[PDB]
Amino acid sequence: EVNSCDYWRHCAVDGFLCSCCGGTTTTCPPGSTPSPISWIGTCHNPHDGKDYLISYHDCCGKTACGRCQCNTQTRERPGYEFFLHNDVNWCMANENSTFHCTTSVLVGLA
Amino acid sequence: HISLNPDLANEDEVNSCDYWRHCAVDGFLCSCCGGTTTTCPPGSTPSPISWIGTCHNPHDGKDYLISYHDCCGKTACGRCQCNTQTRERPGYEFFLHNDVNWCMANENSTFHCTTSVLVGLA
Amino acid sequence: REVLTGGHSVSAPQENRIYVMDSVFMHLTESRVHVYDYTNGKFLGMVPTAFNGHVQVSNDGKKIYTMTTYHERITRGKRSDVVEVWDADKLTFEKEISLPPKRVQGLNYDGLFRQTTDGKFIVLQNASPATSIGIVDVAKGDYVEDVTAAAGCWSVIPQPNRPRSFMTICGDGGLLTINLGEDGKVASQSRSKQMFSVKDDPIFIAPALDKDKAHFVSYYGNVYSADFSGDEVKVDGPWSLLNDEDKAKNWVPGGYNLVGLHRASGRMYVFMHPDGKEGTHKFPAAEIWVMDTKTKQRVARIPGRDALSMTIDQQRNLMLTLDGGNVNVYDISQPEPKLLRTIEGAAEASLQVQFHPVGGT
Amino acid sequence: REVLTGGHSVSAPQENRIYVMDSVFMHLTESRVHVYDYTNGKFLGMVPTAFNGHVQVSNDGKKIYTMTTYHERITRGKRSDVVEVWDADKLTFEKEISLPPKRVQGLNYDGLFRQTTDGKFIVLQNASPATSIGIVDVAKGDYVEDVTAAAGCWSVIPQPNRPRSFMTICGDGGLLTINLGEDGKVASQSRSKQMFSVKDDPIFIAPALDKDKAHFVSYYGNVYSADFSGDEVKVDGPWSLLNDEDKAKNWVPGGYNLVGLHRASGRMYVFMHPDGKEGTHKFPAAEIWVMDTKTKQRVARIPGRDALSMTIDQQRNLMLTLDGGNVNVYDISQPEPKLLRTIEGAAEASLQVQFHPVGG
């Protein structure tokens, strides 16, 4: 279920799911580095009916994973609301900006 | 002598891996990549070295010497990939071998496309 | 008998050429521009653009400009963000212009990489992730400096009625106008009133650009306008693309470079899909709608062929659409577009196509 | 609150890992190695290898070695040919070793990028297009020897019974043996008698490699052998893979890394296809044939699943086959191979798969 684009936490993922790329939802695959910055999504939890803030950190410094590509856009907005926007590389400020995969990190309620 | 002059032939025939002179080609045909059988696509460079061989021309019944040059210095064309192997031999007969990059000695060795240049009667 | 030669020019004339920006997202370090003949679908050549290239053609039609990122060892080593100047007819590299290491890495919206109307400056989006606009002096081969006034804004909309002015869309729902001096530094600027509510009616960044105004569509199918005929930009809207029947079926816009304006007629072209709701703003087109911007009424609707991006040629009255891989060519000299052909397999992952410029002075 | 972390190791033990070298020929500047768990098909990670990368794992299992070419601006600028050392568990870059700008650019035959049995030297094929063999000292991180004696030869076959010896196939149809010193420089060499006729019965370069001998198959389905139990290599052959029924249907070998040897039994595995003629030597397998190299007779044949390349794990009695995109896992503990699973979409354009070494 976590490797599916329809998993509730992945509601604003644009990229390859790290959990399909040798990582997990909250760990980068070996040899790729987390982005210190991210876009942030608000996703509805279908179990408790509450809304959670999800931070979409990319993993960086390896070439494209190529697996489990997703392009979900719930509450995503254009670049004039920059930290809600997912058509940019959230690896853009990493030591190496090559994009590998995207994680879906649960911050908490809201 | 249309069979010897690809520019006078039907494009579909020349752009096919079954065209008689493409008999030991490994790579994307340059004639499908914005070039022709004897011209590299714009901004790519001919290889000064090549693998070689002969191919039978069924249209005139004669055998011809072919030089299989690459065009180099641009990333992969992607179009009309061929992998024909008539009389192709391994790397201990190096100039008959087509599993290596004949762009290997170019200023930039990035492989773009490949073709079959008619040298003469065998 | 034969000799393989290089040094050749593109085989078709400029006026036949289009540029399909292939991101090759699956292998994004080998993005490239594919050059096609729109009249017959022939592949004419290509320009390699490394990691997430962006592309535009010089206004005078002589050069191709690309923007990309290198590293010394691709996935490690020092970063170099650049603009490259390529000869359009020979498809050969001429010049590299160094940028600060913060050029936007992102999908190929037109407004991330543009030029002034007079062609003297390239104007590009930076993100570090702080945003600014970068200015490149084409004559000098130099980066000028950041337009820091554009912090919190996004994308570049040139003003076609002025030589070196452009606008950008800001987080406050208004537009910032920048007027450059002859050296490419900011000479003056202005900020419009709020055009749209960022919270309640967010717009797509892609403009339907006229010579002295721009129209924008919203996530909910409204239209907003920025008129820059005068000293300062005047903003208006919304008006709705939708009639009752449209609204009843929840039609809304969707796509990337999703609108276009045919300037002589005032017709605006927009990708649309039914059953709109939160999260569908990048859905492929079920239909293309053709709107009269004067009467504010729809004048045609045709099948969308799952298109995501488009471009208009004013000089030949054409629209191209692009579904990611295939390019559709339309004649738009009449209110109903006519499909001429489809070029299959033009790209693996493209969200932008552009014509080679003809005329346009 | 969750926190995204890096610095993690591959999630499966080394003994489960395989390496699929994806040339990505359509986008050959972004070749890479994909790391899979053969027991369940799980993707474990990857190593980027730029333009036409080659790969091997260190014999001690600790490091991954790659060989590749960079340019300052990819399609222009200065060329750098390199070997890179990567940690096998963290899949991180550790060291770059500079090579002269003539490393072989070509398809991923095992014999282009190898190592000595003792693991202390990497041994690689050069082509400028003149051929030579390059030696890299792993400890020093240096290119230390260029074997010009190997001009006109091709590929590297390590001798598993000696610490720093290997053979190459020469244009005379014989083998050149090179014995390296502990400094990586050539300590001695020898040339065999002619093993095969280059003109009349060319061999595939891929060895079916035993501890003290190697077998090679030919374009016409003959087998040749090189025995290196002594310092001088003794050569023999041909014997035919084919019986009279096989010959009537024109069966011949075809593929790339097309053979393997199960050392405990002497079984040789070969990709075969019917209707052989000039130009079919790289055709996908219709069948895998299992040959007893002692009796010089076939013992079994199974469907080939259009495979082009294979590799063998001796200690777990496994064979992998690869059709370009998909990896088949076989149990070869008994004479008839048993298919265990297929890993679909392991690569876009791979002609080489390798196990993580477990033998030390």
AA letter at C107: L
D247's CB contacts (< 8 A; 6+ apart) are none
- Strand ranges for B1-122 from DSSP E: 26-28, 45-46, 51-57, 62-68, 70-72, 81-83, 111-114, 117-121
Partner-chain contact D74 C50, CB within 8 Å? yes
Cα–Cα distance, A58 to A35 (Å, whole number): 5
Q: What is the 3-state secondary structure (H, E, C) of C126-163?
A: EECCCEEEEEEECCCCEEEEEEHHHCCEEEEEECCCCC
Task: Report the chain C residue with the minimal C-alpha distance to residue D68.
Answer: C73
Strand B70-72 relative to strand B111-114, pairing: antiparallel
> Other C-beta atoms within 10 Å of C331: how many?
14
Q: Is A98 in contact with A61 (CB distance < 8 Å)?
A: yes
Contact at 8 Å (CB) between D62 and D56? no
Phi/psi for D287 (5° steps) reads -140, 160
Measure in Å the smallest separation between the Cα of C11 and chain A Cα atoms.
Answer: 35
Secondary element (H or E) of residue D183: none
Q: Which chains touch A (3 or more CB pairs under 8 A)?
A: C, D
For residues B54 and D200, what is the distance between their CA atoms, to the nearest angstrom? 17
Distance between CA atoms of residues D249 and C246, nearest Å: 67
> Which of A27, A37, A43, A55 best probes binding to D when mutated, by most D CB atoms within 10 angstroms?
A27
Alpha-carbon gap, residue B49 to D165, rounded angstroms: 32
Alpha carbon distance D356, D318 (integer Å): 12
CA distance C110 to C155: 8
Residues C175 and C194: their CA atoms lie apart, in Å, by 8
| Facing B42 at nearest CB: one of C1, C4, C10 | C10
Measured distance CA(C89)–CA(D9) in Å, rounded: 50
Nearest residue on chain B to D28, alpha-carbon basis: B76
Phi and psi at C164, nearest 5°, equal: -150, 55
The 3-class SS string of chain C reads: CCCCECCCCCCCCHHHEEEEEECCHHHHHHCEEEEEECCCCCEEEEEECCEEEEEEECCCCCEEEEEEEEECCCCCCCEEEEEEEEECCCCEEEEEEEECCCECCECCCHHHEEECCCCCEEEEEEECCCEEEEEEECCCCEEEEEEHHHCCEEEEEECCCCCCEEEEEECCCCEEEEEECCCCCEEEEEECCCCCCCCCCCECCCCEECCCEEEEEECCCEEEEEECCCCCCEEEEEEECCCHHHHHCCCEECCCCCEEEECCCCEEEEEEECCCCCCCCCCCCCEEEEEECCCCEEEEEEECCCCCEEEEECCCCEEEEECCCCEEEEECCCCCCEEEEEECCCCCCEEEEEECCCCCC
Residue C330, φ and ψ in degrees, nearest 5: -120, 140
Cα of A87 to nearest chain C Cα, Å: 6
When CB atoms are compared, the residue of B35, B37, B43 closest to C92 is B43
Q: How far is D70 from chain C (nearest CA, A)?
A: 7
Whether residue B34 and residue C35 make contact (CB cut-off 8 A), yes or no, is: yes
Closest of D1, B24, C105 to residue A88, by C-alpha: C105
* Phi, psi of A78, deg, nearest 5: -70, 180
| Residue whose C-alpha is closest to residue D202's, from B71, B93, C277 | B93
DSSP code of residue D16: G
Write the burial class of residue D200 (CB in 10 Å: 0-12 exposed, 13-18 middle, 19+ buried). exposed
What DSSP character marks residue B82? E
Other CB atoms within 10 A of residue D137 CB: 19
Would an 8 Å CB–CB cutoff place A107 in contact with chain D? yes
- Give the 3-state secondary structure of residue B2: helix
Paired tokens of C236: 């208006």
| D81, two tokens | 């040919």
Assess contact for D182 and D119: CB atoms under 8 A.
no
Best of D1, D4, D92 to disrupt the A interface (most A CBs within 10 Å) is D4
Q: Which of A8, A51, A58, A87 is catalytic?
A: A58
Helix (H) or strand (E) holding B94: none
In sequence order, what DSSP letters do the residues of D81-135 get, joined into one string?
EEEEEEETTT--EEEEEEE-TTB--B---GGGEEE-TTSSEEEEEEESSSEEEEE
Q: Is residue C4 part of a domain?
A: no
Nearby residues of D93 by Cβ (< 8 Å), 6 or more positions away: A31, C76, D84, D85, D86
Ramachandran sector of residue C44 (left: φ over 0; alpha: ψ -120 to 50; beta: rest): alpha
Please tell me which residue of chain C has the smallest CA distance to B40: C6
CA nearest to D89, candidates D145, D45, D40, D141:
D45
Cα(D202)–Cα(D252) distance, integer angstroms: 13
Rounded CA-CA distance D231/D249 in Å is: 41
CATH class name, domain A1-110: mainly beta
Resolution in units of Å: 1.3
Q: Which structure tokens are listed for A49?
A: 């009916």
CA distance A64 to B7: 40
Q: Taking a C-beta distance cutoff of 8 angstroms, is the pair A12, A92 a contact? A: no
Q: Which of D254, D249, D255, D212 is nearest to D230 (CA)?
A: D212
The token duo for C147 is: 């337009």
- The rounded distance, in Å, linking the Cα atoms of C349 and C346 is 9
On whether residue D3 sits in a domain, the answer given is no
Residue B96 — φ and ψ, nearest 5°? -100, 5
Strand partners, C247: none
**Residue indicated by tokens 């400056």:** C121
Q: Are D260 and D268 in contact (CB under 8 A)?
A: yes
| SS3 label, residue A51 | strand
Distances (CA, A) of A11 to A56, B93, C315: 10, 57, 42
Substitution target in D67, D78, D80, D105 with the highest count of B β-carbons within 10 Å is: D105
- We report the CATH number of the domain holding residue C325 as 2.130.10.10
Q: Measured between alpha carbons, how far apart are the two ends of chain D, in Å?
A: 43
**Range of the structural domain that residue D62 is part of:** 13-356
Q: Answer whether residue D106 is part of any domain.
A: yes
Deposited experimental method: X-ray
Residue D15: phi, psi to the nearest 5? -65, -15
Is residue D1, in this structure, part of any structural domain at all? no
| DSSP conformation letters of D291-318 | EETTTTEEEEEEE-TT--EEEEETTTTE
Total of domains in chain C: 1
Q: Is residue B94 within 8 Å of residue D127, measured between CB atoms?
A: yes
Largest distance between two CA atoms of chain C: 72
Closest-CA residue to D124 (of D108, D139, D309)? D108
In this structure, the number of other CB atoms found within 10 A of the CB of residue D75 comes to 24
Residue D284 lies in a domain: yes
Q: CA-based angle C27:C32:C66, to the nearest 5? A: 125
Nearest partner of A63 among A16, A23, A20, judged by Cα: A16
Instruction: Sketch the domain layout of chain B as residue ranges.
Output: 1-122
| CA–CA distance, D241 with D254 (Å, rounded to integer) | 13
- List the CATH code of the domain at B1-122: 2.60.30.10
Order of all β-strands in the sheet with B111-114: B45-46, B70-72, B111-114
Residues of B in contact with C10 (CB under 8 A): 34, 42
CB contact under 8 A, B40 and C5: yes
* A6 given a catalytic annotation: no
Residue B56, helix vs strand vs coil: strand
Distance CA D5, CA C297 (A): 53
The residues of B that are catalytic are 51, 70
Query: Phi, psi (5° rounding) for residue C149?
Result: -60, -20
Chains in contact with C via at least 3 Cβ–Cβ pairs below 8 Å: A, B, D
Strand partners, D311: D320
Distance (Å, rounded) from C-alpha D32 to C-alpha A64? 10
Task: Give the contacts of D225 (CB within 8 A, at least 6 positions apart).
Answer: D213, D214, D215, D216, D235, D236, D237
| D133 neighbors D88 (Cβ within 8 angstroms) | no
Q: Report yes or no on D241 lying in a domain.
A: yes
CA distance B23 to B68: 10
